[model samples]
Target: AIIKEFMRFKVHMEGSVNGHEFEIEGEGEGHPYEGTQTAKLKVTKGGPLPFAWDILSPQFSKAYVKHPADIPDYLKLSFPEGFTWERVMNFEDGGVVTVTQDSSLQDGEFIYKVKLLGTNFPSDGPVMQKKTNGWEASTERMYPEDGALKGEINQRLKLKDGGHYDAEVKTTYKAKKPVQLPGAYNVDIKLDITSHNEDYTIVEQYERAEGRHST
Candidate 1:
């Protein structure tokens, strides 16, 4: 019988959700299992909104893949049906924020763009920021068909006080060569909330397998 080729990796997430200042962090490792690569993540939450802490916390995990070239395939599997407000609001999905694929001016890459038409928050519910007009959020994702993926989400809040609040999150990946192992890519996720004066970030890197030797 032939051996299956796989790689090992590490994943770490750290950040705080605003509106009431909630913090969350977690770390774990990634490896190929059966026929796919996945990370075993463990997270802890801290904040005043204990009720909505889990709901507001960053949801990740569907970002991993057996290989970078398989990103599109992984994306399909990530959201088998489609994207919806329920899915995005509840952190039910990760990866590309929208299903709409934009035509990339440059070849060899894929781009996706979408605007949050209306994400109306309950008047009596926890909000991410001060009272603002309709939430203006959009995401732009660009990735090489065979390489690392990168994207950013931008939100413009027209505050009721005649001011504006801007929030942005950037997701990127990098390929690295470990000292004594096959080189792999690292994933970095970041969130910036200027109004709340806080930031959230998560990073992931893959390493050589430790258990089963591929031969």
Candidate 2:
């Protein structure tokens, strides 16, 4: 049997520092930072599809150019919530993780987990300490930084299957010093997903960072 899946996802990404430089990028259209750009991983049935562009492409512009808001049907299918990409997290020396549930899915139903690592992160990415279960250790400490900030996000998703899905996401930001300004930092992130039937299990991981100047 060929399984059909429909997912609508939005992203809100922001990078800032104490000094001056600040950058904000979304799934579609938004601003960019120096030496930085945005790319999209088309969510497909099996996994993330290929990226459309190379390094340093504007996120908002690309989304608008490819998926415009003027076309109601296309817009509805693309960005149901319009272009309002809100900021999810902020930090001085670490990074943030943003997750959006596709409207095409249920209102609040999904199952997932998140992990974050700093420069010292393993080459692959952060390790998934827990599965569908919520976060146990919210955050961890990295080099140069004194303290680590960690937290878990429990989100509900309305699945097309007529039942609600539960998703738990965990995040951590480690700084170099106890008190540091925002600037260019590195990070690694990992995500785990499980479906209701326990039929679907997925893991998505990546490594990246941003440059933010302090005021």
Candidate 3:
């Protein structure tokens, strides 16, 4: 039996630091189990920035874009009294996550729009600087800026037992200020990252039987 499948996925990151540049590209494989997909990095022309080097592995999986199992409950016209759903993802660096979900059934199809926003402020340098685990900046210094990260996921499902489906996920970040680096260099950096993942990627479809049919 075939579970879920994604045809393609890609993530790209580019940033400039006091005229220095860097980039990271992550691409998914044609199929799952081919192996882990590693992000490509170039720190020379668009090389790595000490504060913006968290590379994402664009490995595709059904869970990455699949709608929640309890989606049906959310689409109901009348939810149970006092019934509510919410998510908050707390990061190690004191950053917090917030989510908003909107779902409905229309024209015999299910539609959902989900968004995740993460925000934080720090007494140190840029709050998002912690994304680069490899960096070892001193805590005494501080950057004059806050950070905001957002992710949007959309899905459309045709659930007459089986039908065509569509899903997509996008991520974006924003923060700019004087940042400290491992080399003891402090410069104004405007680092940003954006990524995309949208395809027909089947999830839990019928599969060819390899053995004899036995009820």
Candidate 4:
């Protein structure tokens, strides 16, 4: 009946579950269908076109998190019951927050580790590391709300201040095989300008749909 821009985009799930290979992609409404997921791309129409990758799923979520020193905040929010913050800075730029290892061979069992990039990390006072244990600590790590950035940091360690450092983090399940556990994912979404083709097939044509349908 009418004309529409018919914007298009794509997403690929690089990581897999149970060795099952799959991904989700789309144009139009950025909604992931049942049994599928989304790459959460925030697209801006004007000013050279920019996109933000704010990914969320039944398993995990992700955020850009500005810089390394600024990373502690996410850790704090990710586990409020657990996370307390200090702050500082480094002679270097960034450090990685890692959850590469876990206990029990089950998913979400993670121990967090942080490095302040050329900065001194005190062991006891204020900035001690977080060891994976206890009931409260386990609950905190379960959902991974703030991209697990702060969850890892709060349990893994704490800081007094951020002296401008870049912080990175990871928490892949320790599996002899792969599985999809709900966790936070971080990715960079950059937009590429290109020409548009306002043509398509009828069988795959777009339509306005909602949650299910009534008889």
* Predictions in order: lDDT: 0.30, 0.23, 0.27, 0.22
Off by over 4 Å in 2: 1-39, 42-146, 180-215
Ordering by TM-score: 1, 3, 2, 4
Q: How well does candidate 2 match the true structure in TM-score terms?
A: 0.23
User: What's each prediction's TM-score?
Assistant: 0.29, 0.23, 0.26, 0.18
State candidate 3's TM-score. 0.26
Please report the candidate that would top lDDT against the real structure: 1
Q: Write one digit per residue (lDDT tens) for candidate 3, span 60-167.
A: 111122222322111122211111223443434454444443333233322223333444524352323432222111111111222322333332222233532232
Q: What is the lDDT of residue 114 in candidate 3?
A: 36
Choose 1 or 2, whichever is better by lDDT. 1
Q: Compute the lDDT for candidate 1.
A: 0.30
Identify the superior model by TM-score, candidate 1 or candidate 4: 1
lDDT: worst 10-residue window of model 1: 97-106
> Across residues 1-215, which tens digit of lDDT does each residue of candidate 4 receive?
01112212232222222122223222222221111112232212221111111111111222111212322223212321222222222212232211121111112222222211112323331212312111111112222333222222122211224322222322322222322223333222222112222211000112221121111
**Candidate 3 ranges with C-alpha deviation above 4 Å:** 1-4, 17-20, 29-44, 55-63, 72-215
Residue 4 in candidate 3, Cα distance off native in Å: 6.3
